[PDB]
Amino acid sequence: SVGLIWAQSTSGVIGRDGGIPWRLPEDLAHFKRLTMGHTVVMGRRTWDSLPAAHRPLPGRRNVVVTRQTGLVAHGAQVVGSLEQALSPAEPDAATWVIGGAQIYALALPLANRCEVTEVDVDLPPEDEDALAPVLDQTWAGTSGEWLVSRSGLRYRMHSYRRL
Ligand SMILES: NC(=O)c1ccc[n+]([C@@H]2O[C@H](COP(=O)([O-])OP(=O)(O)OC[C@H]3O[C@@H](n4cnc5c(N)ncnc54)[C@H](OP(=O)(O)O)[C@@H]3O)[C@@H](O)[C@H]2O)c1
Ligand SMILES: CCc1nc(N)nc(N)c1OCCCOc1cccc(CCC(=O)O)c1
Numbered sequence: 001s002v003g004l005i006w007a008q009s010t011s012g013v014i015g016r017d018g019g020i021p022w023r024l025p026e027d028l029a030h031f032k033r034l035t036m037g038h039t040v041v042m043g044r045r046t047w048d049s050l051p052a053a054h055r056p057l058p059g060r061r062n063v064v065v066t067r068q069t070g071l072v073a074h075g076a077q078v079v080g081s082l083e084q085a086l087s088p089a090e091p092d093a094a095t096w097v098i099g100g101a102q103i104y105a106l107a108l109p110l111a112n113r114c115e116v117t118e119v120d121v122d123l124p125p126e127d128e129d130a131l132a133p134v135l136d137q138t139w140a141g142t143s144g145e146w147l148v149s150r151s152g153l154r155y156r157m158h159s160y161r162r163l
């Protein structure tokens with residue numbers, strides 16, 4: 001089982017200036033609960049985007065997709081393709097693809113689940129933004145109710161499964 005997990009603004013922004021252009025502790029806790037104990041697969045720019053206290057993501061096997069021989073920053077297992085990241089895989093569990101836009105694009109044809117956090121922040125897409133992947137007719141989805149964060153931002157979760 002291969003799952004994509006991401007947080008996006010309503011406008012579909014996931015990334016800006018090498019990071020995430022909002023702060024949402026409730027999403028981080030959701031991300032922790034779904035990924036803890038599992039393999040997380042990410043592109044190299046997302047690896048470098050991790051704050052130092054979260055690089056590597058503790059309690060998860062961190063696999064980084066790169067075309068380089070290896071990385072200066074420690075704690076990852078490097079692979080040269082998504083296929084190499086995904087096999088062999090943890091039994092009875094999802095392998096989570098955790099971004100960014102380039103690796104979501106590679107992983108979307110292979111995924112059977114998407115877990116999306118939508119953040120009601122007003123972020124018109126800017127020229128160099130990373131955007132969320134668009135899901136096609138092969139996905140069925142359900143949506144949770146709108147929630148309010150302690151910081152006042154409204155957010156909700158969407159869960160998609162491959163038909
Ligand atoms: N909101 C969210 O949920 C979320 C989640 C994750 C990340 N983000 C944001 O997304 C942005 C980063 O995303 P991004 O799309 O720019 O980068 P990315 O997908 O994280 O990483 C791109 C890198 O992956 C490697 N790569 C890409 N395609 C490859 C292939 N076919 N084979 C081998 N390696 C390949 C390359 O590494 P090398 O250059 O090393 O060869 C490439 O530079 C940041 O702003 C980050 O904060 C947001
Ligand atoms: C939690 C964001 C997220 N949320 C969901 N739902 N899915 C994801 N794939 C996803 O990104 C995982 C990779 C980035 O991890 C972190 C982890 C901790 C703190 C930050 C701050 C970003 C900054 O300071 O710019 C980023």
